[PDB]
């Protein structure tokens, strides 16, 4: 009706509340499409994600829900804040797309990696990242797909995590997580606990420092090579934990020595060691995150105590009340295209 309008950004069309104008494309990730625009009521910048026919496929709606629900009730400063959800269509009958409005940050990490940062800065950004993640973990939620382009920052040096389309509680035994950031657990057939996110975190930090992608595999298999060439070949106890058929390939892979963290990350790559917050001190944290074996790997809580991160520790920011997930809504129960369409509209319709 008279409350919306439509703009032609590229091929995609944005049918949105009249409140929102001067829209511009910024990104998408892969889970929606995003424009930055000007809220005119509130006279401030926002980000609008469009979700075209989310119900169309079963996976395509799993993500929209996840997102929608999580966005409603998450409450952390290191997580992008929700501003609004809406739909341009008048009732369930003609219902098509959803739009989510949330804060506009200044840029995503991609252009931070190409920077040189001091320890103060970098370690603190990582400390934030951790809190932000910890918040998801404290509800048993796992982000599952942390990456440069899912992390955003502002010029006051603040950081936030976003896109929960893939977020889930723990899983078992179709690769949907992004190649480079895939945990070994994920690469192989294995199930994941939460420290799967710590692997991502390791990948990201390492990247900032490397000024480039850490494990840059050409294909979903090469990506394992990339890991093992680097950090060495898994010890037999890890090898045992594998599915029998893929257990065979991993054993058959060359038995790389894999470089020490000091060669992985030479000093030429770091700035200079102020009041400790050192090359080593970080390197050690890397050396405790990027661990092939998930059970042998550091958790968030621990990552938060680890000296190099610990100097920003704020329990009001660290041990915040966890978000409240409306009761048993996560329970991935696999519904009909029809049931889906309804579920969502009930989450869009709160007013």
């Amino acid at each position: 009706d008279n409350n919306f309008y439509s703009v032609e950004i590229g091929d995609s069309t944005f049918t949105v509340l009249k409140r929102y104008q001067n829209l511009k494309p910024i990104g998408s990730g892969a889970q929606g499409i995003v424009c930055a625009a000007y809220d005119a009521i509130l006279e401030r910048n926002v980000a609008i994600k469009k979700l075209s026919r989310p119900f169309q496929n079963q996976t395509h709606a799993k993500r929209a829900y996840r997102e929608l629900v999580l966005m409603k009730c998450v409450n952390h400063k290191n997580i992008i804040g929700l501003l609004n959800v809406f739909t341009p269509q008048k009732s369930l009958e003609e219902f098509q797309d959803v739009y989510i409005v949330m804060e506009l940050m200044d840029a995503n990490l991609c252009q931070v990696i190409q920077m040189e940062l001091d320890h103060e800065r970098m370690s603190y950004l990582l400390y934030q990242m951790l809190c932000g993640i910890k918040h998801l973990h404290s509800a048993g939620i796992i982000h599952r797909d942390l990456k440069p382009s899912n992390i955003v920052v502002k010029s006051d040096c603040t950081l936030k995590i976003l896109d929960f389309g893939l977020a889930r509680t723990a899983g078992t035994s179709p690769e949907v997580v992004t190649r480079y950031y895939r945990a070994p657990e994920v690469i192989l057939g294995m199930g994941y606990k939460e420290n799967v996110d710590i692997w991502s975190v390791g990948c990201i930090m390492g990247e900032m420092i490397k000024g480039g992608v850490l494990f840059p595999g050409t294909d979903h298999i090469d990506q394992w090579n990339k890991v093992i060439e680097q950090l060495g070949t898994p010890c037999p106890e890890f090898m045992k934990k594998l599915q029998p058929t893929v257990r065979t390939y991993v054993e058959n892979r060359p038995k790389y020595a894999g470089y020490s963290f000091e060669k992985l990350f030479p000093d030429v790559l770091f700035p200079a060691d102020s009041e400790h917050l050192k090359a080593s001190q970080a390197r050690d944290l890397l050396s405790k995150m990027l661990v092939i074996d998930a059970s042998k790997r550091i958790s968030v809580d621990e990552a938060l105590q680890h000296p190099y991160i610990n100097v920003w520790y704020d329990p009001s920011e660290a041990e915040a009340p966890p978000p409240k997930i409306p009761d048993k809504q996560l329970d991935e129960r696999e519904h009909t295209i029809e049931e889906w369409k309804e579920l969502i509209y009930k989450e869009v319709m709160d007013l």
């Binding site: 603190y124 010029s155 040096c157 917050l277």
Partner: peptide
Amino acid sequence: PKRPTTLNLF
């Protein structure tokens, strides 16, 4: 240490 308040995004 003071937390940073600053990030050069240009």
